[PDB]
Amino acid sequence: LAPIPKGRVKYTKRQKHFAWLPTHIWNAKRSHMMKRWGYQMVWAPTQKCFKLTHRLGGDTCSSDGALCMDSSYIGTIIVKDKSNDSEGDFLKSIIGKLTAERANLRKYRE
Amino acid sequence: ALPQRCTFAFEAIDPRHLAAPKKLNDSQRKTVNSDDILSLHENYPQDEINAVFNELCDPESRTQSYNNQNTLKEISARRYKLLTATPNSINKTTVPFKESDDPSIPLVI
Amino acid sequence: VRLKSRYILFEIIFPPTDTNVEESVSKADILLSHHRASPADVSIKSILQEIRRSLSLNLGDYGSAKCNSLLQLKYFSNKTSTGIIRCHREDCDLVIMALMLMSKIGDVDGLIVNPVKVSGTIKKIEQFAMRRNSKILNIIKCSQS
Amino acid sequence: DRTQTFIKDCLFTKCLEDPEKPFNENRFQDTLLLLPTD
Amino acid sequence: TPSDLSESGSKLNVDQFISSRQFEVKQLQLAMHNSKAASSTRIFQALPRKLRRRTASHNVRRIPK
Amino acid sequence: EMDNVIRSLEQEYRLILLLNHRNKNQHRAASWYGSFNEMKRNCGQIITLFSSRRLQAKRLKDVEWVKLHRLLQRALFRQLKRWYWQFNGVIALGQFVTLGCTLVTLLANVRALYMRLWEINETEFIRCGCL
Amino acid sequence: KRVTKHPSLKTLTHKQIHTTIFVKSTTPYVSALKRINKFLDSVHKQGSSYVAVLGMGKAVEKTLALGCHFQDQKNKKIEVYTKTIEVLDEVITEGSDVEDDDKETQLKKRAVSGVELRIYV
RNA sequence: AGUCUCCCACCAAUUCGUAUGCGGAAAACGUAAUGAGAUUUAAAAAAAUUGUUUAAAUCAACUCAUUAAGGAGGAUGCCCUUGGGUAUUCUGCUUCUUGACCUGGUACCUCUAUUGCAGGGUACUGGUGUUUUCUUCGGUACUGGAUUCCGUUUGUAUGGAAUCU
RNA sequence: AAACACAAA
Ligand SMILES: [Mg+2]
Ligand SMILES: [Mg+2]
Ligand SMILES: [Mg+2]
C-alpha cells in the first residue's frame, strides 16, 4: 500500500486520516468538502446547479457547455503477469474469478 | 453517434505552456458525414496507444516525465523573450516546444 | 417591509343596442362593434369620481372608507379604453364588485365594465395587455380576407 | 460642470437605463480620496 | 491638474478629469460603435449574477494572537 | 514631439498606480480589476522602454523598435474591445460607477496616446526592417 | 437478430442548435407549440431570422401539422425542404455463451427521408 | 433581520513559504485542560450587534496568559493478579525545499559585435545598515457568437491576419 | 421595497 505523498508539511499535517486531491484547495474554495471513506472529496458547489447539470450534462440536446469532475479518488490497480512475458493465461483466470466472465471475453481483450 | 471503441492517447504539452485556450481549425465542419465514423472503426494506431499506455504504466518513464518541469517564472521569462524573435512580422504569444529541455506528458482519453 | 398592491385591469365595452338595424354575426365583426371607441368626455378624474360615487352608493360609508385608502387610477387613455386601478389585496373584491355594479357615466349611457386581469404588479399587467392586443390583431387579419 | 454633467448623463444613458438615478440619489462622488488607510 | 495634493493625501477630481478628456471619449465611442453612436438606447446589459462577486474590506488582515 | 507624449503617458501611469494602490484591497476578486491590472502592465512596459530613450542618450534604438512593434499590437486591436466592454459593465451595474467612469476616461486617454505613437512611428517602422 | 440504432450526426456550431426544435415521436403537440413560440420570440435576440423544425420518421406527420398550424393561424411564411438522413446501426454478425450486448458490433448505414420546416417572424 | 468578517484566477514564492492546543481553504471562526483578573485592572465603568446588555455568597457567563504532530522506555492509579487494556507524569529520537529585506568587496560566464569600463545572474565572507510610506504598491493571462483570405511532406502538422454585432 | 458605501445621518 502506497502512502500519502510529500507536498507541504503544513497541509500534509492537517489530513492525517483522509488523503487530499491534487486540487483540494481549489475545490474547497469552490465546492463543499466532506470526509467519509478515508478521503476528502467534493459534495456540491456553492451555487445551485440542479437544472444546470440537467441541461448541460444530461441526455438533452440543447447542451452548450461542459462539466468537469475531479474523480481522482477512484483507486486503481495495475496487474501484470510475471510468470512469463507472454499471454496472460493466469490473468485470464484471475479476472474470471474477480468479476464475471463478462470481463474475460474476446471483445474486451481484442 | 460515435461507436463504443474510442480511446485516444498521445503525448501532450504542459498546459502552462499555452497562454490562451486557442480553438482548433474549424473549416471542414460542414463536410462531416458518416463515412468518417465508419472509417474510424477501421483506422486505429494501436502501436502508439500501447506505447503511451506502457509509458504511463511503467514507473520509470512516469518519473522521467518530471525531468524538467519549468516553473511559472520560467515560462514567464520565456514568453517575455519570445517578444524579440527573428521573424519581425507576426506576433506570437506562445512559446515553441523543445525536444531536449521540455517534458513530454503521457495522457489517455 | 412591503406594501401589498394589487392592480386591476378593466375594459369599457359598448353593446350595440340598436334593434332597428340588422347585424353581422362573426368574431371580428362583434369585436369591432364592441370595441368601437370611447367618447370624448372620458378622463381619469371623471371615471374616478364615478367609481367613488358608486362605491359609496353600493357599499355605504365604511365600505367606501376602507376602500378609498389606496384607490387610484395609475394608467388610462381614452383611445383604447384600458385602465389600471390600484388597490389593496384586501379590497380587491370590493373594487371588482363596484366595477361590476357600474351603471353608467353621468352623461354617457349604454356601457358595461369588464374586469379582465388582476395582478399584484404592473409588469405582468403590461405583458398580459400586450398579449391581448396581439391576440386581437389575429382575428382582424383573418376576417379582413 | 453643466456641460460636463450633460456629457456624464449622455454617457450613463448608454450603460444605465435611468440616467438621472445616481445624480438624484447622490451616488456620483465629485471627489476621489487617494490615501493609505490609517 | 487632474489630481492635487491636500490635507490627507492626493485628491483626484472626476469633473476636470473627464472634462479635459472629452474628444478622446467621443473618438473612442465612434471607434467602438459606428451606426449605434447616433442612437441612444441600452447596449450594455446587466452583469450576470454568476459572475457577480462581493466586496471585501479596505484593511490588510488580522493576525492570529 | 516625443517628450510630450512620454510625459502624458507617465502622468497617466502615476494616477493608475495611485488608484490601484488603494483599490487593491477594496475590490480583490473582480472581473474588471483583471483588465485594469492588465492595462497597467502594458503601460509600464511601454514606459520603461521609452524612458530607456533617455537612459541611453544615443540615436533612438536598433531593436527596441521591433520590441515596440511587438508590444503595440496587443492592446490596440486585441484587448481594447473587451476592456471597454468591462469598463462599461462595471458602470451598468450601478454599485460602483464613480471610479468606473474615471476608468473609462483613463482608457480613452491612454488609447489616444498609443494611436499617436503608432501614427508617429509609422515612418521608421516601414523604413527600418519591417512593414 | 439483435440490432441497435444510434442517433444521427448533428454538427451545429452555436446558434443553429438554439433556433431549432427536433420533434420527437413522443413530443406532445402543445409543448411543441410553446417551444416554437419561445424560439420565434428569442430568434431576433439570437440574431437569426427563421426557426428550424426538424423531424424524421414517425414524427413527420405531426411536424407537418405544426407547420400547417402556424401557416394560417399566425400568418407566417413557412418553407418545407426534403432532406436525407444517414443513421448508423450496430448489428451482430455470426462468426460459448456470452452476453447479448457484448458481441461483435458492425456499423451499417441507413438512409431515411426527413422534412425541415422553417418559419419566419 | 443586522452601518460584522471571509471565499468566489494562479504563482518551489518582494505572492502573510504560518509544521505553533484540536477541527478548518480562510474567517472580529467552533471547542478542550490549567492559573489569574475587576475604572485599586492587560483591558468593560461614575469594527458590528443589542430594551435590560460579563461577573463582583457559591455555581453559571465574558476577557486574557500557556499546552507542536507521531513512534519507544520507566513509575503510579483502575478491571485483572502469566499476561493484556486505558489515564497521568520525566529522559529522549524521528519528523529537513542551501529563503527577513538591503549595501560593499572579490572570483567566473554572456550581450552591446578588440580592451579598461557600462548592466544581469550565480558561490562565499562582513555589518544594523536612517527598512519614520508600522494598513493595499511583485509576475503572467482577449473567458460571447458568425464567416472569409493565405502557407504547408524545404522547416513547423498546424500557424498568421482580416470584417460585423 | 429589497440589495449595496472607508458615503450620508
Ligand atoms: Mg432583506
Ligand atoms: Mg436593509
Ligand atoms: Mg440583508
UniProtKB/Swiss-Prot annotation, chain B:
Present with 846 molecules/cell in log phase SD medium. Component of nuclear RNase P and RNase MRP complexes. RNase P consists of an RNA moiety and at least 9 protein subunits including POP1, POP3, POP4, POP5, POP6, POP7, POP8, RPP1 and RPR2. RNase MRP complex consists of an RNA moiety and at least 10 protein subunits including POP1, POP3, POP4, POP5, POP6, POP7, POP8, RMP1, RPP1 and SNM1, many of which are shared with the RNase P complex. Required for processing of 5.8S rRNA (short form) at site A3 and for 5' and 3' processing of pre-tRNA. The chain holds residues 439 to 547 of 875 of the full protein. It is found in: Cytoplasm; Nucleus. This is Ribonucleases P/MRP protein subunit POP1. The modification Phosphothreonine is found at residue 86. The lineage of its organism: Eukaryota, Fungi, Dikarya, Ascomycota, Saccharomycotina. It comes from Saccharomyces cerevisiae (strain ATCC 204508 / S288c) (Baker's yeast). It comes from the Eukaryota.
Swiss-Prot record, chain D:
It is found in: Nucleus. It comes from the Eukaryota. Component of nuclear RNase P and RNase MRP complexes. RNase P consists of an RNA moiety and at least 9 protein subunits including POP1, POP3, POP4, POP5, POP6, POP7, POP8, RPP1 and RPR2. RNase MRP complex consists of an RNA moiety and at least 10 protein subunits including POP1, POP3, POP4, POP5, POP6, POP7, POP8, RMP1, RPP1 and SNM1, many of which are shared with the RNase P complex. Required for 5.8S rRNA and tRNA processing; associated with RNase MRP and RNase P. Belongs to the eukaryotic/archaeal RNase P protein component 1 family. This is RNases MRP/P 32.9 kDa subunit. It comes from Saccharomyces cerevisiae (strain ATCC 204508 / S288c). The chain holds residues 2 to 39 of 279 of the full protein.
Curated annotation (Swiss-Prot), chain F:
The keyword Membrane applies. The keyword Nucleus applies. It is a single-pass membrane protein. It is found in: Membrane; Cytoplasm; Nucleus. One of its GO terms (cellular component) is cytoplasm. The chain crosses the membrane at residues 84-106. GO terms for molecular function: rRNA primary transcript binding. Keywords: Cytoplasm, Membrane, Nucleus, rRNA processing, Transmembrane, Transmembrane helix. GO terms for biological process: maturation of 5.8S rRNA; maturation of 5.8S rRNA from tricistronic rRNA transcript (SSU-rRNA, 5.8S rRNA, LSU-rRNA); nuclear-transcribed mRNA catabolic process, RNase MRP-dependent. Changing residue 101 to R: In RMP1-6; temperature-sensitive phenotype. Defective in 5.8S rRNA processing. Functions as part of ribonuclease MRP (RNase MRP), which is involved in rRNA processing in mitochondria. Present with 556 molecules/cell in log phase SD medium. Component of RNase MRP complex which consists of an RNA moiety and at least 10 protein subunits including POP1, POP3, POP4, POP5, POP6, POP7, POP8, RMP1, RPP1 and SNM1, many of which are shared with the RNase P complex. This is Ribonuclease MRP protein subunit RMP1. It comes from Saccharomyces cerevisiae (strain ATCC 204508 / S288c). The gene is RMP1.
Curated annotation (Swiss-Prot), chain G:
GO terms for biological process: intronic box C/D snoRNA processing; maturation of 5.8S rRNA; nuclear-transcribed mRNA catabolic process, RNase MRP-dependent; rRNA processing; tRNA 5'-leader removal; tRNA processing. The keyword Ligase does not apply. Its main location: nucleus. The keyword tRNA processing applies. One of its GO terms (cellular component) is telomerase holoenzyme complex. Its EC number is 3.1.26.5. It is found in: Nucleus. Signal peptide: none annotated. The modification Phosphoserine is found at residue 96. It comes from the Eukaryota. Keywords: Hydrolase, Nucleus, Phosphoprotein, rRNA processing, tRNA processing. It holds the Pfam family Rpp20. GO terms for molecular function: ribonuclease P activity; RNA binding. It catalyses: Endonucleolytic cleavage of RNA, removing 5'-extranucleotides from tRNA precursor. Belongs to the histone-like Alba family. Component of ribonuclease P, a protein complex that generates mature tRNA molecules by cleaving their 5'-ends. Also a component of RNase MRP, which cleaves pre-rRNA sequences. Component of nuclear RNase P and RNase MRP complexes. RNase P consists of an RNA moiety and at least 9 protein subunits including POP1, POP3, POP4, POP5, POP6, POP7, POP8, RPP1 and RPR2. RNase MRP complex consists of an RNA moiety and at least 10 protein subunits including POP1, POP3, POP4, POP5, POP6, POP7, POP8, RMP1, RPP1 and SNM1, many of which are shared with the RNase P complex. This is Ribonucleases P/MRP protein subunit POP7. It comes from Saccharomyces cerevisiae (strain ATCC 204508 / S288c) (Baker's yeast). The lineage of its organism: Eukaryota, Fungi, Dikarya, Ascomycota, Saccharomycotina.
